[PDB]
PDB file of N, CA and C and ligand atoms in Angstrom:
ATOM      1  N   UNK A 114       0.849  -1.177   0.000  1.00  0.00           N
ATOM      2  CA  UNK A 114       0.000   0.000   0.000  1.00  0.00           C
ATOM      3  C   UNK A 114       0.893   1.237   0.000  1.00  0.00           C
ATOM      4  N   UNK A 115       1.010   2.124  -0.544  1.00  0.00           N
ATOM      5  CA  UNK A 115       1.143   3.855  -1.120  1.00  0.00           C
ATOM      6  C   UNK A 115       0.661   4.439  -0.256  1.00  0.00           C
ATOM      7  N   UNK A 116       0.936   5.308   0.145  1.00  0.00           N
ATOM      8  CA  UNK A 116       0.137   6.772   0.812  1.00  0.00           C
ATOM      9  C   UNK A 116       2.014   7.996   0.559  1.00  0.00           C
ATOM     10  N   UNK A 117       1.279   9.029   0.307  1.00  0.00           N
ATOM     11  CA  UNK A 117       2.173   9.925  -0.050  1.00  0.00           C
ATOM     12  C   UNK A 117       1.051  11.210   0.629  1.00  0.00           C
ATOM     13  N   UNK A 118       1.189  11.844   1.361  1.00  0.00           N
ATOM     14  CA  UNK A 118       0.458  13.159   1.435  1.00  0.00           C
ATOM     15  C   UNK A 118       1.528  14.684   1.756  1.00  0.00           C
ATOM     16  N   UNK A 119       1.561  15.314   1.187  1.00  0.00           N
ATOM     17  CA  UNK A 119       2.325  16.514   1.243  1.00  0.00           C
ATOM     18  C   UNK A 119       1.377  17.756   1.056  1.00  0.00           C
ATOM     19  N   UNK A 120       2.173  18.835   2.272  1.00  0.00           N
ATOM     20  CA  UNK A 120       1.644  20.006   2.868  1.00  0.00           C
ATOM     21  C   UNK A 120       2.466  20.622   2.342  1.00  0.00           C
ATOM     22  N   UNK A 121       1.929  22.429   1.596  1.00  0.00           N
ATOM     23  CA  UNK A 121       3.517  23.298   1.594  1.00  0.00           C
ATOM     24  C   UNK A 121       2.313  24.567   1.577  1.00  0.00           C
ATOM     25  N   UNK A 122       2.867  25.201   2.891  1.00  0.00           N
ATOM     26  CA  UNK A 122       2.216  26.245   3.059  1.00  0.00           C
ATOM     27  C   UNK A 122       3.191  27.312   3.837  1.00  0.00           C
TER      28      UNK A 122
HETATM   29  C1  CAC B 479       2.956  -1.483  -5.298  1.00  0.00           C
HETATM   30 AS1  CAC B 479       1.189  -0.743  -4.865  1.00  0.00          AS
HETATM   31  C2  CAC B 479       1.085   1.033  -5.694  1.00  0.00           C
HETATM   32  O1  CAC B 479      -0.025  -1.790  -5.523  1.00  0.00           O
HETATM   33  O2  CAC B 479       1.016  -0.490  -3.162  1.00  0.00           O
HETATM   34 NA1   NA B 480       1.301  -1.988  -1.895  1.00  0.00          NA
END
Protein backbone atom coordinates (compact mmCIF):
# COMPACT_ATOMS: atom_id res chain seq x y z
CA UNK A 1 0.00 0.00 0.00
CA UNK A 2 1.14 3.86 -1.12
CA UNK A 3 0.14 6.77 0.81
CA UNK A 4 2.17 9.93 -0.05
CA UNK A 5 0.46 13.16 1.43
CA UNK A 6 2.32 16.51 1.24
CA UNK A 7 1.64 20.01 2.87
CA UNK A 8 3.52 23.30 1.59
CA UNK A 9 2.22 26.24 3.06
C1 LIG B 1 2.96 -1.48 -5.30
AS1 LIG B 1 1.19 -0.74 -4.86
C2 LIG B 1 1.08 1.03 -5.69
O1 LIG B 1 -0.02 -1.79 -5.52
O2 LIG B 1 1.02 -0.49 -3.16
NA1 LIG C 1 1.30 -1.99 -1.89
Amino acid sequence: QYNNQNSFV
